[PDB]
Amino acid sequence: QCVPDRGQQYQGRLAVTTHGLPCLAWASAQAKALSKHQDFNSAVQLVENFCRNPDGDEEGVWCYVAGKPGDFGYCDLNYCEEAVEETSEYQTFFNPRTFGSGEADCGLRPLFEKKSLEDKTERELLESYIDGRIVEGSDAEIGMSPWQVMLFRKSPQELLCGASLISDRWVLTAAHCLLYPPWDKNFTENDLLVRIGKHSRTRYERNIEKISMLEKIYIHPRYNWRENLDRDIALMKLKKPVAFSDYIHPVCLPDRETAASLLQAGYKGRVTGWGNLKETWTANVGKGQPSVLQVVNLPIVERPVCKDSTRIRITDNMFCAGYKPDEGKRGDACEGDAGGPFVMKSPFNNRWYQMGIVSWGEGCDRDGKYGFYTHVFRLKKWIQKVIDQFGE
Numbered sequence: 001q002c003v004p005d006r007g008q009q010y011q012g013r014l015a016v017t018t019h020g021l022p023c024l025a026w027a028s029a030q031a032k033a034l035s036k037h038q039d040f041n042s043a044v045q046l047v048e049n050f051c052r053n054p055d056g057d058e059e060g061v062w063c064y065v066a067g068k069p070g071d072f073g074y075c076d077l078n079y080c081e082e083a084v085e086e087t088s089e090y091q092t093f094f095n096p097r098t099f100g101s102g103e104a105d106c107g108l109r110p111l112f113e114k115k116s117l118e119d120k121t122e123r124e125l126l127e128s129y130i131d132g133r134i135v136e137g138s139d140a141e142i143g144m145s146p147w148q149v150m151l152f153r154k155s156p157q158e159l160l161c162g163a164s165l166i167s168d169r170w171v172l173t174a175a176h177c178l179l180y181p182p183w184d185k186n187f188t189e190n191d192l193l194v195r196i197g198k199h200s201r202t203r204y205e206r207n208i209e210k211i212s213m214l215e216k217i218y219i220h221p222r223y224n225w226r227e228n229l230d231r232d233i234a235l236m237k238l239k240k241p242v243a244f245s246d247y248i249h250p251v252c253l254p255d256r257e258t259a260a261s262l263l264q265a266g267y268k269g270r271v272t273g274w275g276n277l278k279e280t281w282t283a284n285v286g287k288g289q290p291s292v293l294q295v296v297n298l299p300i301v302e303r304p305v306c307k308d309s310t311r312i313r314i315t316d317n318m319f320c321a322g323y324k325p326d327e328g329k330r331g332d333a334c335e336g337d338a339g340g341p342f343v344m345k346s347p348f349n350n351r352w353y354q355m356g357i358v359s360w361g362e363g364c365d366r367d368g369k370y371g372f373y374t375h376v377f378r379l380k381k382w383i384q385k386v387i388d389q390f391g392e
């Protein structure tokens, strides 16, 4: 009875967004003559202005909305819980001329994979957690996460969240870092700057660390703080495309095929951060505050295990990680950076894929729960449509 196949078969009557905005017709002026550069699918009925899924977006049905031509909105329908969980090759998804360069080389670490070398913990991501010896989190080697991005509040100069470098031009982060009115947070481009290529938070890293400006900030349409922080997802373009170094390199994106196979293959994940989430919370000086980038290998534990741990509802776009709650074996809730990356290394091509964007996940100061994360595999078609909105 619930919506299957992600709305590709839907012909019922509903033509407005999740947030309450009017759907421009598919036969309308800008939605026709101006918007068409995609190889759409001619299997879905393109009726009037009804929400449909002609590109087969893993997020579902959508429409173009009244605004600056190109803008689009998702429509709140009753989808079925499609639990994603039960050389060195790559193919480019987005067109390099708008997503920037780096895609065709993503994941491959300058100072590791490309040097035919391993990091001190990557030969640990490939085992099922062996029990007893939990190799704790700690000081990160240099160049260990070349996608690791910091998000600074311009003035009065302040660090807000972590983030991920996907290409020379684009970065992904949690949407709550920027828009969150339970906290007043209504940040815009002008208030924010990023520092890419840093390993130490405080100290200045000469020539190494670059620092850049933001151009436009896209908060993904189906974002709702109003309940549980669903779709904690925001995308920000850079004013000035960054030059890849040995300390700067983008991270690859999984789709359903790739994310699932990673999950079926993998046993763990990596949260590189600074203690940002941990610390921001005025959970405060709960002891130290790591001066240097931090790293930890976190096992994903099965959905039924995660659902039972919290009060609230895990959506198939949110996912757990970490170790067991214990009297004398304590886990690591609220880990790394807000909107920071949680990653996995594809054994199928030795590349690194970002699987998780971190969240406030109240199972945090619960003090015996799992860290909750946001899934990344659904964004690909949305991203595609967003960058197409920009142009050369």
Ligand SMILES: *[C@@H]1O[C@H](CO)[C@@H](O)[C@H](O)[C@H]1NC(C)=O
Pocket (backbone or CB within 6 Å): 179, 186
């Ligand atoms: C945030 O505040 C600015 C005030 O200049 C306003 O233009 C904008 O619409 C606000 N954004 C949201 C999402 O409320």
